[PDB]
Amino acid sequence: VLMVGPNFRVGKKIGCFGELRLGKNLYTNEYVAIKLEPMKSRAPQLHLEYRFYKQLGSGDGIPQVYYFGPCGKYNAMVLELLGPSLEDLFDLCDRTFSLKTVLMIAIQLISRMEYVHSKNLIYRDVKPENFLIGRPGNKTQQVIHIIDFALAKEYIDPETKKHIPYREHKSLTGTARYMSINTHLGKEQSRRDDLEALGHMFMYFLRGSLPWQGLKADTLKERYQKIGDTKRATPIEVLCENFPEMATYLRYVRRLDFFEKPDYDYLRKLFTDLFDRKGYMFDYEYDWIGKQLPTPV
Numbered sequence: 001v002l003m004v005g006p007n008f009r010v011g012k013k014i015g016c017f018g019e020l021r022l023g024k025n026l027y028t029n030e031y032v033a034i035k036l037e038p039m040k041s042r043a044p045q046l047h048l049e050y051r052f053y054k055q056l057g058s059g060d061g062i063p064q065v066y067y068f069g070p071c072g073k074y075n076a077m078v079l080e081l082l083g084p085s086l087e088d089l090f091d092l093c094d095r096t097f098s099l100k101t102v103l104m105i106a107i108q109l110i111s112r113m114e115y116v117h118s119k120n121l122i123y124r125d126v127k128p129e130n131f132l133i134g135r136p137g138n139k140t141q142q143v144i145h146i147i148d149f150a151l152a153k154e155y156i157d158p159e160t161k162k163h164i165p166y167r168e169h170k171s172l173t174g175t176a177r178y179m180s181i182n183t184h185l186g187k188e189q190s191r192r193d194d195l196e197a198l199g200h201m202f203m204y205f206l207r208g209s210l211p212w213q214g215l216k217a218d219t220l221k222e223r224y225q226k227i228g229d230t231k232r233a234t235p236i237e238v239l240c241e242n243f244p245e246m247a248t249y250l251r252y253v254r255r256l257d258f259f260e261k262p263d264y265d266y267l268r269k270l271f272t273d274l275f276d277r278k279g280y281m282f283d284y285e286y287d288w289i290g291k292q293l294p295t296p297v
């Protein structure tokens with residue numbers, strides 16, 4: 001039987017750098033998530049992720065981390081078990097979300113991203129698969145959590161205490177569908193890029209797709225370039241037709257300077273004012289409420 005530490009039992013695979021396992025804290029009768037990485041790995045990422053989680057600390061919508069240590073031939077990280085991702089739930093809702101659902105998601109994720117940034121980190125891996133509700137049934141099912149900090153970076157260098165310098169010729173980080181235009185161009189990512197990728201994701205949810213999806217090329221590099229070219233060639237006014245506030249959001253974040261602190265309040269208020277004008281109540285009645293939600297246990 002595979003164990004981590006004195007008390008965490010490692011169970012079945014629930015997903016796939018490394019595997020994700022269902023685990024159980026035997027001391028407390030609580031299920032947990034256990035991320036495994038082979039000790040033999042070329043390019044380990046698990047210890048770096050654990051360090052980022054520790055830097056984030058205890059925050060709203062940040063998964064709790066319980067243990068890091070060896071587990072047979074693996075390094076193991078034991079964390080809070082969460083429910084389905086936004087991609088999973090998007091599929092469950094026939095691949096569109098209502099405006100009310102997208103705004104409840106957006107308001108929370110602007111805050112989630114402000115929190116990450118307040119801990120001197122940029123995220124660099126925005127995608128619907130990395131935002132998870134809490135376990136169906138529990139007190140945090142309503143909370144949209146952010147996971148997977150393997151691609152994060154300290155944007156304030158603790159050596160200098162200053163913002164990281166601008167540079168280019170960076171290897172492309174994250175998912176092509178959502179990444180910022182400046183990420184496509186090989187520029188160092190900063191706070192602006194996290195918020196721009198969120199914007200793309202919001203429009204994906206609202207539209208059901210993005211116009212640069214399904215572009216193919218003979219190489220990965222050429223494919224990224226084509227997606228980038230289409231992002232640049234698609235006017236914000238067109239992409240965000242019928243969603244004026246989203247156009248305002250996207251234009252704002254696209255125009256941020258590399259070093260600039262986003263005005264998180266301004267962006268939230270774009271969406272909360274809209275939310276109010278539409279007469280929505282922030283009651284966490286997402287589109288998926290009432291549906292059969294997948295569960296890890």
Ligand SMILES: CC(C)[C@H](CO)Nc1nc(Nc2cccc(Cl)c2)c2ncn(C(C)C)c2n1
Pocket residue numbers: 014015016020033035063079080081082083084085129130132147148294295296
């Ligand atoms: C393995 C992936 C498909 C999913 C979604 O990205 N990842 C995932 N699923 C989690 N839960 C999960 C996995 C499969 C089905 C269901 Cl319903 C939930 C999960 N719980 C905690 N974390 C991290 C904080 C380690 C998690 N990460």
